[PDB]
């Protein structure tokens, strides 16, 4: 439910150690949580709202130019003037020009001319700025339940750095104390909220100041005084004489292609509503009751409807409707190996399954985590108990290798935040955030700023230095760096 | 002394971060009693718990009488990222401050 089949989901399970945990829940994933006791809950990021913004610059991606004046003085008296200069709205450049005899100017010797033109721009790129506070994370979380696909179960939590603690009601389940952090996630206050025509996306305080276009200086309305203005024009003098000026038209596509590194942000409005996003929440169980443990278990036929299926992470949903009994009864979920002895084998995801009863509605749908071999999934009670063959078909060392690769991507994206992703009580974890904190920080410090081919290339330059000469020390650390870069391009390949 | 002074707290302004390693907070205290005293903590752990860092202002106190009296408090969070805590044993608003370095 709410989680199954996102292909990015991740399981996290605490080993008592009190209720502690803490999982970096990340937009695009849904993190599911299971405990010894307790129900099991699914949490995913949903939408990250940036509430209040304030304007910095605008620029312009499409020029247009008005009348063109001239004002050419002869070789004697030099500089020209052109009263339409000395405005905000007229751009000018002096270009000493050909003009000896034939036409005024009783000497040779060139003679300046001032030709200017009026710059009024068509559209605005309007960069907006955000600061980490007042942004709003909205996380929705759902527990596994009878609901099959049609609410004491899923709760809606919105976590503001003005309220980093959150505690969500679940009637007959528990609180799910959420201590989130709405600040450290994305490195905001670097990102600016950038608006081309009717689109929006975030870019860095470095890229947004460095674009060479007209400035609006964050000005309001009126007839904005445009800084620069020169970079967008084109003063060219044909052969020696008659300077001409051209508009050099809309660059909208040019910023678009120059913008390859940004993430796009969905909406605008009174509030910028963006996507992706990165949160580290300290998830706190404290109050969760299973609510089913007191029920009777019900003896009745069970009839699958949707035949069970294998999710990408390997967990298997199975939907069971059944008539014939009443009461909000438990149902036996144990999967088995021999049909003879049940001998429950394989961990169950749904913890305690139950039923809403009412009439012959049923519909639970609990989901399971079968062993790496062949397995019979048996939902049933007495002699007539309905089963399904399974054959998970993934190897165990395959799963371990899987969780490692996956671990390496979480470690590649979240940087130093990988460590503490599923933190708990061990200290060696703090040593991790420390050790990868200093290598991470100094790594991003000297490099940072490295494009795809930059890091692939310098990756192999470091690996050819990896095995080129001398000692087993520096060659070793160069080979290590090269490993990290190449590995960092390889990751995020899709 | 002033007991510890207990009632609701609502952050007036989103608090601030000075350039000299400080966080400044204003609080309403939702109107209970006179010249009482309300604590605050910098808590790395849980909502509150252990106190780390240091209060640059000392003996943070409510002034007097009706509804809201704002207590502005110079606080230096630890070099990490904590959760300002306003002081009610239970009902309290909080934050997350990510001081740098």
């Amino acid at each position, epitope marked *: 439910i709410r989680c199954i089949g996102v292909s990015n989901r991740d399981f996290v399970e605490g080993m008592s150690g009190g209720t502690w945990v803490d999982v970096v829940l990340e937009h695009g994933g849904c993190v599911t949580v299971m405990a010894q006791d307790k129900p099991t809950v699914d949490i995913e990021l949903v939408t990250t709202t940036v509430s*209040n913004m*304030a304007e910095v610059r605008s620029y312009c991606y499409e020029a247009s130019i008005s009348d063109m004046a001239s004002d050419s003085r002869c070789p004697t008296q030099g500089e020209a003037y052109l009263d339409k200069q000395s405005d905000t709205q007229y751009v000018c450049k002096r270009t000493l020009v050909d003009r000896g005899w034939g036409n005024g100017c009783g000497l040779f010797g060139k003679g300046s001319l001032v030709t200017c033109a009026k710059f009024a721009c068509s559209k605005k790129m309007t960069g907006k700025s955000i600061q980490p506070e007042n942004l709003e994370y909205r996380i929705m979380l759902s527990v596994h339940g009878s609901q099959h696909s049609g609410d004491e179960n899923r709760a809606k939590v919105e976590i503001t750095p003005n309220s980093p603690r959150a505690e969500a009601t679940l009637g007959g389940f528990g609180s799910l104390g959420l201590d989130c952090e709405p600040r450290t996630g994305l490195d905001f206050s670097d990102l600016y909220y950038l608006t081309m025509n009717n689109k929006h996306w975030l870019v860095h305080k470095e890229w947004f100041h460095d674009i060479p276009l007209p400035w609006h200086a964050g000005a*309001d309305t009126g007839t904005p005084h445009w800084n620069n203005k020169e970079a967008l024009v084109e003063f060219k003098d044909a052969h020696a004489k008659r300077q001409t000026v051209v508009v050099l038209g809309s660059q909208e596509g040019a910023v678009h292609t120059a913008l390859a590194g940004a993430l796009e942000a969905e909406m605008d409005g*009174a509030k910028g509503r963006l996507s992706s996003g990165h949160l580290k929440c300290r998830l706190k169980m404290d109050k969760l009751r299973l609510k089913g443990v007191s029920y009777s278990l019900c003896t009745a036929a069970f009839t699958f409807t949707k035949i069970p299926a294998e999710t990408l992470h390997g967990t298997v949903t199975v939907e069971v409707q059944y008539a014939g009994t009443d009461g909000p009864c438990k149902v036996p979920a144990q999967m088995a190996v021999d049909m003879q002895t049940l001998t429950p084998v394989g961990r169950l995801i749904t913890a305690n399954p139950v039923i809403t009863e009412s009439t012959e509605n049923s519909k639970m749908m609990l989901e399971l985590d079968p062993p790496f071999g062949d397995s019979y999934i048996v939902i049933g009670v007495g002699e007539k108990k309905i089963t399904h063959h399974w054959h998970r078909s993934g190897s165990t060392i395959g799963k371990a290798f899987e969780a490692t690769v996956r671990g390496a991507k979480r470690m590649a994206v979240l940087g130093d935040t990988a460590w503490d992703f599923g933190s708990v009580g061990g200290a060696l974890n703090s040593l991790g955030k420390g050790i990868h904190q200093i290598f991470g920080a100094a790594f991003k410090s000297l490099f940072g700023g490295m494009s795809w081919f930059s890091q692939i290339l310098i990756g192999t330059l470091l690996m050819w230095l990896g095995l080129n000469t001398k000692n087993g020390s520096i060659s070793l650390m160069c080979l290590a760096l090269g490993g990290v870069l190449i590995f960092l391009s390889t990751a995020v390949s899709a | 002394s002033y007991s510890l002074c207990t009632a609701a707290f609502t952050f*007036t302004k989103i608090p601030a971060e000075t350039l000299h390693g400080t966080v400044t907070v204003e609080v309403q205290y939702a*109107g209970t009693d006179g010249p009482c005293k309300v604590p605050a903590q910098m808590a790395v752990d849980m909502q509150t718990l252990t106190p780390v860092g240091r209060l640059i202002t000392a003996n943070p106190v409510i002034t007097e009488s009706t*509804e*809201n009296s*704002k207590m502005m408090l110079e606080l230096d969070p630890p070099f990490g990222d904590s959760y300002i805590v306003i002081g009610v044993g239970e009902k309290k608003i909080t934050h997350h401050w990510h001081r740098s370095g």
Partner: antibody
Framework: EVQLVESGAEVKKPGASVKVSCKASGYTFTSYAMHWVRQAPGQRLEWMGWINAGNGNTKYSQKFQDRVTITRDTSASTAYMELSSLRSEDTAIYYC?????????????????????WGQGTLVTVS | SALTQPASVSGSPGQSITISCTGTSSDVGGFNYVSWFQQHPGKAPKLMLYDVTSRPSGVSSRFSGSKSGNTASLTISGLQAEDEADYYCSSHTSRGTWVFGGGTKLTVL
């Protein structure tokens, strides 16, 4: 307590010049201040003020950037706003209020509060 | 300029009123400067704001200020009835001049 009062009800011909006095009483005309806020009944308060009684500086709303000039004198602890070339439109009430200057005596950024007190009011009407 | 403020309003005693003043980024948005000035008709205006949320000491704790984006909201509850004083919102602009909103005639029924 803090007391400000000024010239009483007064009338001027169109094109005349009003001179209103603000006599500050009950506080220290030190980290002074004063303002001038025009009001007649039924419209928006305009603020055409000035802001500095220590140094005698002034800032005017462009609105009336050059019309009013202001004299400030501690011996009488009094600020005199004088609006020259008044018009039928200006018939109004001119309050003088204060917003305390900062320690340095230079007034740039106000107190977070502005007007903790107000003049008595002077109704000025144009024929 | 001319702070947008709506002409006039009313309601049962004790009932919440909110008068919202809408400025621009030049003044109300990019500053904490706000003031709501209770002006008794016939008498001199007074203070009933100070740096938004806070209040001068002689203020009926009734009053409450708030701000979002470009807004100034004076929200009053627990009305004592005799508290309709034309409410004017005023703030310090960025240019260094003060502007007073259109004012709200307050209607006590």
């Amino acid at each position: 307590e803090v007391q400000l009062v000024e010239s009483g009800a007064e009338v001027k011909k169109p094109g005349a010049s009003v001179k209103v006095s603000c006599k500050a009483s009950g506080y220290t005309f030190t980290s002074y201040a004063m303002h001038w806020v025009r009001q007649a009944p039924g419209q928006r308060l305009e603020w055409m003020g000035w802001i500095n009684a220590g140094n005698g500086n002034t800032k005017y709303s462009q609105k009336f950037q050059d019309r009013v000039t202001i004299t400030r004198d501690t011996s009488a602890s009094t600020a005199y706003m004088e609006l020259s070339s008044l018009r039928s439109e200006d018939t109004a009430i001119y309050y003088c209020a204060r917003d305390k200057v900062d320690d340095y005596g230079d007034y740039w950024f106000p107190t977070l509060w502005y007007f903790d007190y107000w003049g008595q009011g002077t109704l000025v009407t144009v024929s | 300029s001319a702070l947008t403020q709506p002409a006039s309003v009313s309601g049962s005693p004790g009932q919440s009123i909110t008068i919202s003043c809408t400025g621009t980024s030049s003044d109300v948005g990019g500053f904490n400067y706000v003031s709501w000035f209770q002006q008794h008709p016939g008498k001199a205006p007074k203070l009933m704001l100070y740096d938004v949320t806070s209040r001068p000491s002689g203020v009926s704790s009734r009053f409450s200020g708030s701000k979002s984006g470009n807004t100034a909201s004076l929200t009053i509850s627990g009305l004592q009835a005799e508290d309709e004083a034309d409410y004017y919102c005023s703030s310090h602009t960025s240019r260094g001049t003060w502007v007073f909103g259109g004012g709200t005639k307050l209607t006590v029924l």
